[PDB]
Every structure is written in structure tokens, then in C-alpha cells.
Amino acid sequence: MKTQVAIIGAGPSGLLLGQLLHKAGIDNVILERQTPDYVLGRIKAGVLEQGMVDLLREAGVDRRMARDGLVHEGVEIAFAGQRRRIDLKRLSGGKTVTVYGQTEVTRDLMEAREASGATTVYQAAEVRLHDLQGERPYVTFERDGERLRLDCDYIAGCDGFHGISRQSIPAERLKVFERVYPFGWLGLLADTPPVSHELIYANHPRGFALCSQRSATRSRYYVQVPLTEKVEDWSDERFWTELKARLPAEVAEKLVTGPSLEKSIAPLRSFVVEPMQHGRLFLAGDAAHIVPPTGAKGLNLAASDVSTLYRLLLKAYREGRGELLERYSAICLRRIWKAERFSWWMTSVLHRFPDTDAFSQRIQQTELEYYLGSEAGLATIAENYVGLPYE
Numbered sequence: 001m002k003t004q005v006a007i008i009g010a011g012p013s014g015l016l017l018g019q020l021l022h023k024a025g026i027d028n029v030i031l032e033r034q035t036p037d038y039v040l041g042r043i044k045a046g047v048l049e050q051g052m053v054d055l056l057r058e059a060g061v062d063r064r065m066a067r068d069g070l071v072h073e074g075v076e077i078a079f080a081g082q083r084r085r086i087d088l089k090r091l092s093g094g095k096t097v098t099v100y101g102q103t104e105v106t107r108d109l110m111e112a113r114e115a116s117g118a119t120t121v122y123q124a125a126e127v128r129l130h131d132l133q134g135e136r137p138y139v140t141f142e143r144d145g146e147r148l149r150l151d152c153d154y155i156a157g158c159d160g161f162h163g164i165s166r167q168s169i170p171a172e173r174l175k176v177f178e179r180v181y182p183f184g185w186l187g188l189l190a191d192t193p194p195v196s197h198e199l200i201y202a203n204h205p206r207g208f209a210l211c212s213q214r215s216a217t218r219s220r221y222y223v224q225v226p227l228t229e230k231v232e233d234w235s236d237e238r239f240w241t242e243l244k245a246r247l248p249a250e251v252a253e254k255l256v257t258g259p260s261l262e263k264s265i266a267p268l269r270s271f272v273v274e275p276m277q278h279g280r281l282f283l284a285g286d287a288a289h290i291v292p293p294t295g296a297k298g299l300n301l302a303a304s305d306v307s308t309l310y311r312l313l314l315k316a317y318r319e320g321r322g323e324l325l326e327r328y329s330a331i332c333l334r335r336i337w338k339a340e341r342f343s344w345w346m347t348s349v350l351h352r353f354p355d356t357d358a359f360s361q362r363i364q365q366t367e368l369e370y371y372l373g374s375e376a377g378l379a380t381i382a383e384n385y386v387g388l389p390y391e
């Protein structure tokens with residue numbers, strides 16, 4: 001078969017890019033290793049930036065989000081006795097964030113695509129990329145036991161952290177920057193009313209805790225745990241008792257608990273690769289960079305990469321300006337590093353790190369006291385949280 005743009009991965013990155021391209025008249029094919037329900041089983045992101053909200057609207061897949069998403073104007077940080085609210089809307093100059101689950105965004109995009117009739121091959125096994133630097137690259141894969149070949153002009157690697165795309169670039173061509181954190185996040189999804197109308201990030205001596213939500217009758221909670229923990233060692237009971245222990249008494253007493261729908265541990269990591277492209281292969285989303293969940297930047301960075309790729313591909317196709325695709329990495333990397341810095345900062349001030357001396361503990365506390373007490377400090381958090389402008 002043949003197409004214009006081959007997309008590896010049917011996660012939100014690939015589906016969004018595919019939708020934007022299809023709409024602009026650029027044919028694309030999406031190859032996914034797993035099945036539709038496997039993809040739909042991933043409970044991940046809950047917070048979207050305005051830029052991503054507008055892109056969904058531009059892709060024409062915002063009906064349900066507009067109806068079901070929750071717009072938030074503030075967020076809270078609880079630390080050593082106090083709870084401080086950051087008014088995102090006034091400190092950022094009017095911007096807000098939207099709480100709408102990643103499973104939901106994915107479902108909406110999958111429906112949009114199924115209806116458009118664009119090509120999507122699930123269970124595409126053994127995907128391999130070829131002739132990345134030639135004029136006619138191609139992808140080979142197996143559907144059943146037959147190896148099919150797909151010819152194309154460009155390939156977008158939207159296959160996540162463990163995808164084949166990033167592995168397909170000569171190692172010597174890429175420079176990696178990575179930081180692994182000595183802890184993960186144990187998350188629990190429950191069909192219970194959230195404890196607050198806004199998110200609560202808590203720095204507690206026992207470790208980090210976070211109170212989030214998906215809707216008015218569905219919550220998502222997290223607690224920082226050592227990388228040596230097993231989710232099977234965390235019963236629902238143990239989770240709730242631990243969560244309550246890390247929250248302000250007044251918050252903990254309002255908590256409606258309940259049986260988990262999902263429980264999993266996500267280890268924290270920072271990862272960036274430079275550049276984000278090779279020949280006719282362009283990386284997007286988790287395939288090029290990972291940010292710890294603390295700043296709620298991952299999916300939002302994927303959205304900006306995609307927005308940039310989509311627009312550079314449009315110029316190349318409709319305007320015949322193929323030369324602009326060479327500036328893809330420079331453009332994306334500017335935003336990526338800024339968000340990595342914020343996610344890193346958020347992570348360092350909200351979590352309890354092992355083997356930290358007295359001095360560094362006091363500084364972590366003072367960082368919070370200063371940034372949450374200064375008008376200028378609050379503004380740096382707010383403008384970064386709502387999302388820095390797209391370039």
C-alpha cells in the first residue's frame with residue numbers, strides 16, 4: 001500500500017495528528033501494535049492546557065469535551081500546615097486548564113477517525129522503518145503472518161517511550177538527557193465524588209499526595225511511593241489510610257472513599273532527545289521526551305509537537321515548502337525544555353527525597369513559602385501551569 005504520511009502509534013499524539021492531517025486533505029495511515037480496547041484501558045492524563053483544548057476544537061473533536069470537561073481557574077498546594085490557592089486565571093492573565101481524561105480524548109479521536117474512513121491498522125506487529133534518508137521511505141509490518149509494505153513520503157513516530165521510532169535513528173545521531181527519580185506515583189481511580197472542586201497537591205513529611213478528578217462522581221488520587229513497591233501490596237484500605245495521613249485534617253475528613261476501578265504505579269522520569277527527527281522521520285510526544293507527571297505537561301507537550309508538525313507538513317504539501325520541515329526540532333525543543341524545567345521544579349518542591357540533609361529540607365520549604373507568598377512568584381507558577389504560548 002501507499003500513503004502520504006505514515007503514523008506509528010494510535011495514542012493521542014498519532015490520532016490527533018492523523019485527524020488534523022485528514023481534515024487538511026493529507027492522507028495518512030496509522031499503525032498500532034495493540035488493540036483499540038488496550039489503548040482505551042490506559043488511565044493517564046487528566047489535565048489539558050488551553051492550547052490543547054483549541055487544537056481539539058480545530059481537529060473538530062470537541063463536542064463531548066466541551067460538554068463534559070471541567071474548566072478550572074485555580075489549583076491548591078498544601079504544605080506544612082497551610083493550603084494555598086493559586087488563582088491561575090488572574091495570575092496568568094485570564095487562562096485556565098481543563099480537566100478531561102486522556103481515555104476520553106482518545107475515545108473521541110478514535111470515533112472521529114472511524115467515521116472519517118481514514119486508515120488505521122491495529123495489531124500491526126513487528127513494525128520496522130526503512131530508508132529514512134531516501135526520497136521514498138517505507139514501513140514494513142505483519143498483519144496475521146503476512147508482511148505488508150507501506151510506502152510513504154514521511155513518517156511520524158508517535159509510538160511513545162518504548163516505540164520503535166526512536167530506536168530506528170542511528171544512536172550516534174542522538175543526544176539523550178535523562179533523570180530518573182527515586183520514586184513513583186501510585187494512582188487510584190474511584191467512582192466517588194472528588195474531595196475538592198480544584199486539585200490539591202500536597203507536600204507532606206510522609207511523601208507527596210495529589211487529589212484530582214475526572215468528573216463530579218469520579219476521582220483520581222496519587223501518593224508518592226518508593227520504586228520498590230508492588231501494587232499488589234497496596235489494598236484499597238491501605239491506600240485510603242495512607243492518603244488521609246498525608247492530607248490536611250479538614251480535607252481528609254471530607255473524603256468519600258471507595259473501591260478502586262484502577263490502581264497502578266508510574267515511575268517518575270525526565271527524558272529529552274536531541275534532535276527530534278532524522279531524514280523523513282519526525283518524533284512526537286512520548287517518543288521524543290518524558291516529563292514527570294507533577295506539572296501535567298506530557299500530553300500537552302505532545303499536543304504542541306503535533307501542532308507544529310501538522311503545520312510544517314501543510315506548508316510542505318500545499319505550499320510545496322518542504323524545506324521548513326528542517327526546523328521542526330528547533331521549534332519544538334524551545335517549548336520542551338521550558339516545560340521540562342517547570343516539571344522538574346514542581347517535582348523537586350513537592351516530593352520527599354531520600355537522603356536529604358537539613359539544609360536542603362529547609363530550602364525546599366522556603367521555596368514553597370516564597371513562591372506561594374510572592375505575587376511575582378505565584379505568577380511564574382501560574383503562567384507555566386496554564387501553559388506557555390505555542391511558537
Ligand SMILES: Cc1cc2nc3c(=O)[nH]c(=O)nc-3n(C[C@H](O)[C@H](O)[C@H](O)COP(=O)(O)OP(=O)(O)OC[C@H]3O[C@@H](n4cnc5c(N)ncnc54)[C@H](O)[C@@H]3O)c2cc1C
Nearest residue numbers: 009011013033044045046047159160285286297298299300
Ligand atoms: C500517571 C500519569 C499522569 C499523567 N498526567 C498527565 C496530565 O494530567 N496532563 C498531561 O499533559 N500529561 C500527563 N501525563 C502524560 C501523558 O499521559 C503522555 O504524555 C501521553 O500519553 C503521550 O501520548 P503519546 O501518544 O505520545 O504516547 P502514548 O500514550 O504512549 O501512545 C503511543 C502509542 O504507540 C503505540 N506503540 C508503541 N510501540 C509501538 C510500535 N512499535 N508499533 C506500533 N505501535 C506502537 C503504543 O501502543 C501506544 O498506543 C501523565 C502520565 C502519567 C503516566
